[PDB]
Amino acid sequence: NPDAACLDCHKPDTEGMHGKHASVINPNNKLPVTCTNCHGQPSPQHREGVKDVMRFNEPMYKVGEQNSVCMSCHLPEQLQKAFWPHDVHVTKVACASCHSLHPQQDTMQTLSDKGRIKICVDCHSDQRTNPNFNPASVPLLK
């Protein structure tokens, strides 16, 4: 269990993977998805706050760096078929500004029809009125 190493320090509930990715198979190796598949690997300096592991929806990494990890498994063509606005956001805002992957359910998969339009308004309006908007880290929808 390669996840057990992380869970020696991290909280198995809130920092455990309890969303859909807990039950999926990694298309690259046909094994269960592990922590490092999304976060990469800690260095000896990990506890100090260094650019070792990936951090999602936080200011440390550029949008392109954050989102590229998802694309080690996901396919841009298929994302379009699921939800058109994906393409224009792939390089522009953190995937995790919308998706929540650690909890038992993802906020995006439960949105009503109205909610799927309100997210556009909420974040685009924030960009117009918030001088400190940072596309790498948006707490708005959380």
Binding-site entries for heme: 6, 9-10, 35, 38-39, 70, 73-74, 95, 98-99, 120, 123-124
Which residues are documented as binding site? 6, 9-10, 35, 38-39, 70, 73-74, 95, 98-99, 120, 123-124
3-state DSSP assignment of residue 91: coil
Amino acid letter, residue 10: H
Show the site string, 59-88: x = touches ligand HEC by CB under 6 A, - = not: --------x-xx-xxx---xx--xx-xx-x
Handedness of CA 10, 14, 19, 22 (dihedral sign): positive
Instruction: Report how many residues bind ligand HEC under the rule CB under 6 A.
Output: 69
Q: Where are the alpha helices (DSSP H) in the chain?
A: 3-6, 35-39, 63-70, 76-82, 86-89, 107-110, 115-129
Contact predicate 72/27, CB 8 Å: no
Q: Distance between alpha carbon 120 and the CA centroid of its chain, in Å?
A: 18
Asked if 5 is part of the footprint of ligand HEC (rule: CB under 6 A), the reply reads yes
CB of 18 to ligand HEC, least distance (A): 9
Within 18-37, which residues bind ligand HEC (CB under 6 A)?
20-21, 24-27, 33, 35-37
What is d(CA 112, CA 86) in angstroms, rounded to the nearest whole number?
18
What is d(CA 23, CA 30) in angstroms, rounded to the nearest whole number?
12
Q: Which residues of the chain form contacts with ligand HEC (CB under 6 A)?
A: 3, 5-10, 15-17, 20-21, 24-27, 33, 35-39, 41-42, 46-47, 49, 53, 55-58, 67, 69-70, 72-74, 78-79, 82-83, 85-86, 88-90, 92-93, 95-102, 106, 108-109, 111, 116, 119-120, 123-124, 135, 138, 140
